[PDB]
Design a protein around this nucleic acid. Sequence first.
DNA 1: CCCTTCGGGAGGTGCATCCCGGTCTCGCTTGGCCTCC
DNA 2: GGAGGCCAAGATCTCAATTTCGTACAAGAAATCCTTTG
Lengths: 235, 342, 342, 520
Amino acid sequence: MLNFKPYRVIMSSLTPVVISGIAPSLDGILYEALSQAIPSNEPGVVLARLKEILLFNDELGVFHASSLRFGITPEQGIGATTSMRCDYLSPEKLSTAMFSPRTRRGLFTRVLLTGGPTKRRMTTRPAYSAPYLTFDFVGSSEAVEILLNHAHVGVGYDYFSAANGEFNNVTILPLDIDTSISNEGMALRPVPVNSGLNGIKGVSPLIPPYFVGEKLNIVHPAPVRTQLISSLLRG
Amino acid sequence: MRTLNFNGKISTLEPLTVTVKNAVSTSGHRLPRNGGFNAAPYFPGTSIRGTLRHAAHKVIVDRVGLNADGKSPFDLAEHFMLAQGVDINGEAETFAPGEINAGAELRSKNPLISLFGRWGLSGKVGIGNAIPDGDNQWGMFGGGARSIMFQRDESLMEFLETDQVDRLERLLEEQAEASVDISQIKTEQDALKKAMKSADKDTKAELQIKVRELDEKIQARKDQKQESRESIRRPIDPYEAFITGAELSHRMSIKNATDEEAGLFISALIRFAAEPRFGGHANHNCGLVEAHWTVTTWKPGELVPVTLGEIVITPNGVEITGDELFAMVKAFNENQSFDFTA
Amino acid sequence: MRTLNFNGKISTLEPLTVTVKNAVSTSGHRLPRNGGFNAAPYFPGTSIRGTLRHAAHKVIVDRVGLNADGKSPFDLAEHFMLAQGVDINGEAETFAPGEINAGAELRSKNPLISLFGRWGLSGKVGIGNAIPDGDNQWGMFGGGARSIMFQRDESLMEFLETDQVDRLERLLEEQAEASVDISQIKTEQDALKKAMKSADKDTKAELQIKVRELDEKIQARKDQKQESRESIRRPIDPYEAFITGAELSHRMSIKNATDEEAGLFISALIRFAAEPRFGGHANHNCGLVEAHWTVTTWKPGELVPVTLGEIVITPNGVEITGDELFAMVKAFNENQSFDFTA
Amino acid sequence: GKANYVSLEKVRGLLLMDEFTDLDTVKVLEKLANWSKPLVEFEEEYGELPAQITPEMVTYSIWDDIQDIDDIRLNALSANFIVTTHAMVMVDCMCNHRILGDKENMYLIIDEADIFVDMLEVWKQRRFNLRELTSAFNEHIPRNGVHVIDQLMNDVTSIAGDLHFCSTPAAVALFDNSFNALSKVGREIKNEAARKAFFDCIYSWEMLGLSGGQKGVGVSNKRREPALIAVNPFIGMNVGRYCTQWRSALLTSATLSITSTPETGMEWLCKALGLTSDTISIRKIFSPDVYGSMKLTIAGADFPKVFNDPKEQIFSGQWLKAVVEQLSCIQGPALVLTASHYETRMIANQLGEVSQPVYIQKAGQALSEIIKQYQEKPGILISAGASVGVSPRGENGEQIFQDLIITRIPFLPPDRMKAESLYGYLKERGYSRTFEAVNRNIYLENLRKVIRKAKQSVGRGIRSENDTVRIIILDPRFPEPTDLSSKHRSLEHIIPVRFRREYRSCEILSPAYFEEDIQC
DNA sequence: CCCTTCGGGAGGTGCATCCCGGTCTCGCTTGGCCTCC
DNA sequence: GGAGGCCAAGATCTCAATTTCGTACAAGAAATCCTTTG
């Protein structure tokens, strides 16, 4: 229970953002940030504290936290780059000082890195490299500023592991109209199908974390939305 | 449990570079830029994460020690579990997909698999990217050229036998002819590529099955070299690195971590300070860094960062400041009940 | 296996220069600039690494012993593999990825390859870039101008016959007229290169073709010269070089350096001290350097490293301090279990 | 100040001896003789005594030891709130509390703490008066060398000019050359003990200079004597020690925060005064939610570059023309705040009468004269960086400048020697950092100094809650609202947080990329 | 307790190089063949 | 005789070419100035 005002948050993207099909919702970023702030992974308490910094739609069952929208400037636009993760079995990793390989003829059985359960996993994921990221939300500007600046949270699939979508220079500006849930009838974030908002059908939990809870039918915006930075700063 | 955010700066002692397949192109080796060429590169957090995971795994190996036979107790399965979290033998606790706080037993028993995750267990350590703090802090380092030793220092020829001198002359002749052949083949390839940007579908298909055959001709000509497959007098392509003394803002964190897991992380950082190398091109001493990380935590309930201490890695030593950091380190040194063999 | 970090300074005795193909352009000769065009030049770690590798190669050649007629038992392939890490035979044993202790046997029997590495084998020695100290420690050295010997000293003319005097007359007249023509075509080329910057890149391609044919016409005009192909009298383009007395902080590392490999590296430094030259324009004695390095080892898991000793290279001699460096050098010199063949 | 006080019984000598042909003064000077109180308490509170009772003559004396100042100090010592200049505080820099008393007893509230820590630099000054050294060694005098000492004394006067301190590359170059030629003279002193004393003196000056801080050339306030100024590199923490000596000190200022975040925009004091975590009790930024109204006009990226060649301090003709045009487009009283007096000169020369009275701050002219002249007749007032915390009041409290024009952001010049001194310090401290890294650190610190200085400049406007200001930044380098990736993005902190919306919606005089892209 | 000079004048030209030589890889699974147990 | 390891072989094909921070500032005082002058 705190006075919530519609704010738009714009940050400078530093690394490619990997979208997990559904555009990353700022509510999820804030949920992760609070899970870091409150040393607890229990969804109930983290959600209860998230409602204190974000406006929650009871009738609609979501937080006022728009999905990711790529702020593109006339200098740099939305770019297609691959978030690229490779196992690097260095000579130090491949040495008897670190483990005991099975031996035959006194020779150490080399690890088959070309394939199998012990291969060099070349996991490549799509990622969108825009100069800025933007979200809208009806919440406390102080708490979200503190979280986004100091909590280890990024935009995309794995900021924790892959460090994808690192951001900085988080700038919050007030808005005039709440553009978190709806935008002239176009959902700007995951919402239930019965809400009457159009967009793209999908399956996902309405409330974060988006990897737990029954995946019920939802309507979500385009995964990759781009807007001019000048238009985003207009408010 | 506590969330320890290591917010700090990495000052580069010798140029910091990394090879990334997407970033690297035929034009040259470029760092990941998250955009066009006229953008700010970032050192991947994946590379730092893997380096610190390797450091932590070495710390665990040292803590465990060696068997009575002088061989590491870890096998291939356990070694890969601890190094890269790949269950090769198919024997791992398949935690429930929806239960977040799963593996508390495994987390307590294996602090390494707790800090960095395995496949199916979310890691506790989030290693961010090293973002430069300036607009011109990267450059085309390395480069240079491989020079034939006997064409630079004539004295080195006094050691070669006349048979080997003739071998050298044959090598140089083969190199010259291979160069003057491959250059013409590549000129033909360039002309075909120039014709690739005015072609239609049919002639495109005709003139790109030709380019690869020219490449096969290049490979065959290189194979024809009897004395050396590759030209020795090679101009080395430069690699893009961060300049020496680049202040890169680095954001790391550990999430809801027991004091023992944080102690393992600090020990891994201390061990990393022995060889504080990030990235490749170690031949040119690339990767040497000195970093100062203010270790903060979150106040219970309040969204305020408390400063628990500082971690300053420098060539002159590791400076751990803050009592709680020492407490975590000793706690990791204690609790010998860790089980890295299961 | 100790991780020896050489941290020190290279003072400049005579100007230090290096011509890297990447840094130098048609604008002139520039030292490798760290980040930007307006950034501090650095002597590449590549050049220092190559110099030290050749010094170590000579150390190994002398240690193995030249045959009666001053010829080392090594073949050409062994020399190339030791000094440039390039195998001309192709018989060098490539270590397939995933081999445990990849090349530990080769490292043990070939300390030099262990230090400086090979293709597929990591080199323990990382030789970093030498960054300068202070605001201005570089400048455009060299320069000047080639001058006709006979037009500077008339006394040299008494050593020429009448036919040679007439030949000199022809040479000078040919140089003058060919230079007039070359300057005219170069003026037209410069006008075209100034027009180069027009936004119409589709016409920039044609302008580039025009430049290429203009250069071809310059080459043809120079070929139409019986006496001198190249203008004898011409100003020498200066080369960027670090000033004399310039202090350049330098850092090298040897990861997991056995006493044998460390001793080989110290012996390489000692032999390099005989000809302490780093880079090019040796005609002007460029490259002479006096370097002092502190060797510090860092036991992993220890907060602070311990200084084993100091290596100081000066024109008056090589001073090695600390019993550890002497012990490593002696261990390398006494160990007779090295086979640099293949 | 002690000398600031009203003069002594010599004032009664002024009561008689009425040579001054005024004939209205006698009664007020009789009143003065019976009022031995501060100038502000009496002279500036009873009509200001214009055209009479000259302050210059009743100003105590520069070498006045009377013991009545001690009596006034004791009278004012019994107090709870005391108001004085920062100087008096700073007097204790070397004065071992010979003018103040107990520290644990009282608190110290430094208002305008930004001005305090800026004025430290003026007080981070130890001057090597070459005339003083000449006079000191009048017996062990290698008189042949005296010419050099005079010649350098001439050069200082040429470089220092009319300034008490100048850090130009000319100044540091002359510092080094003078000290090298004085080491030359060092091998001329005959007496070996005197030779060693001289050598140790110049060596101490050399380490004081190079080890840390800034070198420069000084011209003493009185007698205009040449001197070589250096900065004490360890008295920076002594002021912090002095503040902590008080029971509880509070440094408060209007521009102390470079950024809007307390725990990241305050390190300039944390490092400048040496305060570590022992003395960071609270760091908070308090600004009014709504205080006055601010309209913003900015020079876009396409606006002409200020300096065609900043190394030689050459203002581009295009930018000067645009500034002149925009100034001519004003329709009400305005306060132009330049950075340099040279820039003031050039804009004054290019600009003409625009139906608005022009006023100029001549180099060295005290701003009181110009501000008083401009008050009665408002209009265009060009003021250089001399005005740091003085705003022109409208003589009754009303705003008399609808427009505040910052022609260029007051970027500090590169300090090639401060970087060298810091690099040498860190090198001797063992820290391994390249010279370019130290250059970057010094550049960022100078940028924060610039942000604070232009925050002070902007603070000249909106002095009252009803004040409305149109702030016009004509610098091309000021970050555009849409250009969030500009190198000087931190300059956005110049605008107060409350008016950041007005920063977003601002008239751009020359916006770049001013089209409607289709890849939206 | 004097009284500090005039101005002359300020380059002409050369000549601006040649050439190397631009790498391997590998991100998977399976069976055939080799020695090992 | 089964059971680990090392090597070779397996279909044709994906598109994209990069250019260099910031410029000039200086208030009221214990001071040492000083020491006069003598």
